Design a binder for these strands. Structure first.
Ligand SMILES: [K+]
Ligand SMILES: [K+]
Ligand SMILES: [K+]
Length: 757
DNA sequence: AAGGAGACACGGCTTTTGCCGTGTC
């Protein structure tokens, strides 16, 4: 299968490499014949000669238009005639560009920001990740020596761990006595051995967890300190650290660096995103964390290293298992979009739709819109509207089902033929007209985007049936991946339509989909209420929760399924709800916020978690305790007893001052800060006394009883004397603990006043 | 091997029915 593509310059000429793995054998194919190009639109077909002779100079050499060619295409369905301007080297384009545009005879340019290696994938109709191939895969993690305030990677790496189908192992430069540890002499040797293991195992995929930001950069700086040629590429080269806009991404040539963190962070909601959180959420069991200060100990002592190594072998073992769960999904998205898994797994859905469209656009000789310019952008961004809103029921409900709207939207786009090339077309036989908001969609021919969604959904239906004709759970799981990927992809078109940066943006389409949505959602709600006696507890843009007042779990579930058939059969054409889960009890605070608990007792929240940087254990501990009281034991009064008791204990200084410490971190030379928060004012005055304060320093403070700013009365927990000092219990109650729990409990009728003391 | 550019609430300040500067997930 194709794993990746890139190009290399040689003798000034571009060369495409296609990286494959076919029948257990890695190989690199070459293409020297692929010409870069853009599209230009001309006022008159004659001024071509003035253009076919434009030139700009970059990196010494002058750049010409190696060739022009007049070609006929479609732009948004309507025929268009443009000039396809060829070149010599990909890099020519971002330089000759604005000079071709500026020319008075040129109206516009198109398809001038498509990365050459991706341009290749599309035009030759090549598709990464297709075929039977068993890819060979390796997870790895490192565990470093850390002390607060050190420059990045000043500390040495202590261990490198790796795992795959054969098991996990650790490489460390210190004698430890476990059957999966490989002792070597130094860190320089540790690294070199890791490098050898990778070279020998030759994996197609290296799996990290945030390797994009930590591990690879660490290993880089260390390999420079110790003169190790850090070679992981299959063509003998080092990890290529790349800037993606806001963050970094690391590439290993001829392999697939699969960074789990951006995949899991897109996939699931979570307060935290640690390895041990992620592993737990997905697999059930917890992962016994072993902290940095606890690590530096066992190393500098030499005692309890056998613990610290178990942690590293598990980081690797865990990272592998997560990879194996998440890979087959990203692999499906890669096939579907037709781009490398290295790109796809790092993309937003907005961005998958875009690449998908770009490919299909080509398949259909359809010139692509350009991105928004800077003003056309801001114009869109001001014209923003959301989705379906509905007020929630107060109170704590039982046996609740959740039903999913997300699949309605692409069905709507298909059913009412919603797309920019069908929007307000003059002279049609038939129209669909969006409710409330009035946009007309031609119905004579299928539009571009409805056309392709029709194919995706058909494909999904085909897969879903094939799953029913198979008992083998391995093949069933594999098909299930394909089925869910399509759902993910298809369901991204709604947000995409009103996505300001989108090429095929269309406000009218988004509003139109929102209106038809409101209608079908409203119908569904009316149906489940009137005809099935459900009460709808909460409903937003992607689903609603509902129950039968007073019914029991078996009943509600039976009745929910019956409603699914009824409404799925009744709603027009391809429109269908989906049953996305059941919850023991739950409560719903506003348009956007709620908490529910399932039949295994896993609480889930939305818009309720403490999210502030300057939090405190006492705040977090109390909210946690409240939710458990409400959701797990269904006992609102206990939750009120608990909050009261905490506010009491607070004001009578009997809350362990530890629980009041706030950990905030320093990011720059204090000089540089343009404004001074508390933790910065604490630190600032520590520095005025010549104490070591560096980027990376964790300020740990209490707020004390007094007046005015929080900065003026926050002290280092270090300097806190229980005997002498008095904590600001008013702050901890009003600013910290109560805002964490107030919204939850007002929902049940309780006022702030009731929780106070 | 190529260009890209987010959401969200904190404390504090010649905006307690806002605009920064900030730095987390
Ligand atoms: K022009
Ligand atoms: K239907
Ligand atoms: K913090």
């Amino acid at each position: 299968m194709i794993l990746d593509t890139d190009y290399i310059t040689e003798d000034g000429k571009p060369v495409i490499r296609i990286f494959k793995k076919e029948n257990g054998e890695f190989k690199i194919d070459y293409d020297r014949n692929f010409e870069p190009y853009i599209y230009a639109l001309l006022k008159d077909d004659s001024a071509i000669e003035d253009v076919k002779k434009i030139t700009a100079e970059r990196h010494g050499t002058t750049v010409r238009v190696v060739r022009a060619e007049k070609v006929k295409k479609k732009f948004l369905g309507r025929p268009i005639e443009v000039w396809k301007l060829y070149f010599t080297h990909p890099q020519d384009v971002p330089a000759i560009r604005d000079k071709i545009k500026e020319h008075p005879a040129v109206v516009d340019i198109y398809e001038y920001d498509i990365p050459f290696a991706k341009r290749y994938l599309i035009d030759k109709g090549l598709i990464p990740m297709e075929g039977d191939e068993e890819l060979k895969m390796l997870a790895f993690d490192i565990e470093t020596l850390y002390h607060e305030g050190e420059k990045f990677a000043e500390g040495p790496i202590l261990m490198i761990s790796y795992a795959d189908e054969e098991g996990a192992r650790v490489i460390t430069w210190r004698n430890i006595d476990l059957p999966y540890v490989d002792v070597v002499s130094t860190e320089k040797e540790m690294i070199k051995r890791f490098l050898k293991v990778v070279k020998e195992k030759d994996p197609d995929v290296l799996i990290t967890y945030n390797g994009d930001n930590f591990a690879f950069a660490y290993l880089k700086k260390r390999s420079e300190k110790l003169g190790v040629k850090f070679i992981l590429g299959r063509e003998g080269s080092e990890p290529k650290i790349q800037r993606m806009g806001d963050r970094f991404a690391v590439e290993v040539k001829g392999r697939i660096h699969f960074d789990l963190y951006p995949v899991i962070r897109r996939t699931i909601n979570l307060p935290t995103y640690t390895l041990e959180a992620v592993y737990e959420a997905i697999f059930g069991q917890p992962k016994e964390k072993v902290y940095a200060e606890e690590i530096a100990q066992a190393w500098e002592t030499g005692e309890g290293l056998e613990r610290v190594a178990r942690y590293s072998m598990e980081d690797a073992k865990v990272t592998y298992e997560l990879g194996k769960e998440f890979f087959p999904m990203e692999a499906q998205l890669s096939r579907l979009v037709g781009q490398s898994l290295w790109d796809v797994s790092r993309s937003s859905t907005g961005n998958l739709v875009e690449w998908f469209l770009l490919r299909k656009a080509y398949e259909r000789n359809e010139l692509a819109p350009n991105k928004p310019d800077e003003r056309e952008l801001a114009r869109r961004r001001e014209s923003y509207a959301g989705g379906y809103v509905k007020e929630p029921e107060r109170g704590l409900w039982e046996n609740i089902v959740y039903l999913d709207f997300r699949s309605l939207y692409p069905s709507i786009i298909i059913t009412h033929n919603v797309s920019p090339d069908t929007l307000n077309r003059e002279g049609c036989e038939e129209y669909d007209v969006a409710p409330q908001v009035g946009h007309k969609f031609c119905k004579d021919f299928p539009g571009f985007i409805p056309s392709l969604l029709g194919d995706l959904l058909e494909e999904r239906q085909k897969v879903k049936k094939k799953m029913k004709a198979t008992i083998d759970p391995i093949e069933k799981k594999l098909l299930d991946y394909r089925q869910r990927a399509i759902k993910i992809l298809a369901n991204s078109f709604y947000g995409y339509y009103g996505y300001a940066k989108a090429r095929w943006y269309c406000k009218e389409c988004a509003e139109s989909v929102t209106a038809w949505g409101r209608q079908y959602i409203e119908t569904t709600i009316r149906e489940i209420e009137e005809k099935f006696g459900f009460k709808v507890l909460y409903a937003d843009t992607d689903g609603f929760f509902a129950t039968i007042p007073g019914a029991d779990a078996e009943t509600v579930k039976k009745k929910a399924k019956e409603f699914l058939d009824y409404i799925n059969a009744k709603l027009p054409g391809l429109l269908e709800l989906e049953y996305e889960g059941f919850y023991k009890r739950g409560f719903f605070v506003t348009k956007k916020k709620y908490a529910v608990i399932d039949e295994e007792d896993k609480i889930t929240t939305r818009g309720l978690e403490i999210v502030r940087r300057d939090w405190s254990e006492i705040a977090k501990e109390t909210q946690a305790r409240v939710l458990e009281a409400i959701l797990k034991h269904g006992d609102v009064e206990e939750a009120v007893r608990i909050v009261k008791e905490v506010t009491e204990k607070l004001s009578k200084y009997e809350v362990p001052p530890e629980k009041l410490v706030i950990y905030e971190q320093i990011t720059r030379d204090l000089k540089d800060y343009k404004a001074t928060g508390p933790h910065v004012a604490v630190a600032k005055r520590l520095a005025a006394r010549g104490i070591k304060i560096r980027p990376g320093t964790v300020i740990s403070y209490i707020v004390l009883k007094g007046s005015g700013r929080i900065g003026d009365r926050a002290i280092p927990f270090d300097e806190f004397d229980p005997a002498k000092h008095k904590y600001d219990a008013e702050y901890y109650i009003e600013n910290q603990v109560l805002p964490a729990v107030e919204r939850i409990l007002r929902a049940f009728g309780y006022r702030k006043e009731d929780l106070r003391y």
